[PDB]
Amino acid sequence: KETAAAKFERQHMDSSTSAASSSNYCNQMMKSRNLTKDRCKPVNTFVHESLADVQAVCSQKNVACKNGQTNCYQSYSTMSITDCRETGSSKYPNCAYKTTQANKHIIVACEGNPYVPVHFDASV
C-alpha cells in the first residue's frame, strides 16, 4: 500500500516549479496527483521547495498540530507554497480550484525512521 511518506510527496510536493505561474495550476495538479479521483478534495497545499528542505523541517520548531498532536514541526523559514481551494463551480468529476501563490511557514507532522513528513497541517 502507498506509504504515508509517499502520500505526502504525492499530495504536497511540487519541486519542479518555483511557484504556480498560472491560475489553472490547482485544476491541473489536483487532477494529475489523483487528488480528485474519488471526490473533490476541498483544500490542498503544494510546496515548491526541494524535498530535502521540506524533510529538514522534521528537525526544526516542534509545535502542536491543529488537532493537538505533538509530532508537528514548523519551518524556520518561509517557503514557496500554492494553496488550492475548491470553488463554487466545482462539481465532481470536474473539480474546480482557486489557485493562491504565497510565501509562508509550513507546519507538517513527522513520523518514522527516517523521520519524515507524513501530513501537511497548515501554513502560517
Side-chain angles (χ1 to χ4, degrees), residues 1-100 102-124:
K1 206 293 164 65
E2 186 178 33
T3 69
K7 188 169 167 239
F8 176 93
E9 299 181 30
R10 179 171 60 80
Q11 304 193 297
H12 300 296
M13 292 301 303
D14 186 7
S15 286
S16 92
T17 70
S18 293
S21 72
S22 162
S23 77
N24 221 14
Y25 180 88
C26 286
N27 289 338
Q28 308 129 21
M29 294 294 293
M30 293 290 282
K31 182 174 210 307
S32 106
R33 297 292 187 87
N34 295 137
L35 314 175
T36 68
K37 189 204 35 164
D38 293 328
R39 59 184 175 86
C40 302
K41 188 182 173 209
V43 315
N44 193 57
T45 306
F46 288 98
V47 184
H48 305 273
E49 304 297 341
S50 75
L51 179 66
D53 287 349
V54 175
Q55 293 172 337
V57 175
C58 292
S59 68
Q60 295 181 10
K61 198 177 197 163
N62 183 220
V63 292
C65 309
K66 284 172 184 174
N67 79 338
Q69 284 169 215
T70 54
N71 64 319
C72 276
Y73 295 84
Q74 184 192 298
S75 64
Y76 290 143
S77 302
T78 66
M79 291 178 169
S80 169
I81 67 168
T82 307
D83 258 62
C84 299
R85 197 139 22 227
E86 189 172 32
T87 77
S89 277
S90 191
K91 178 87 198 320
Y92 186 89
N94 305 301
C95 303
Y97 301 91
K98 179 193 190 289
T99 302
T100 308
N103 274 98
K104 302 190 158 283
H105 300 265
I106 66 169
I107 304 165
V108 303
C110 304
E111 300 179 7
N113 162 253
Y115 199 61
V116 297
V118 297
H119 146 89
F120 187 100
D121 205 54
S123 63
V124 291

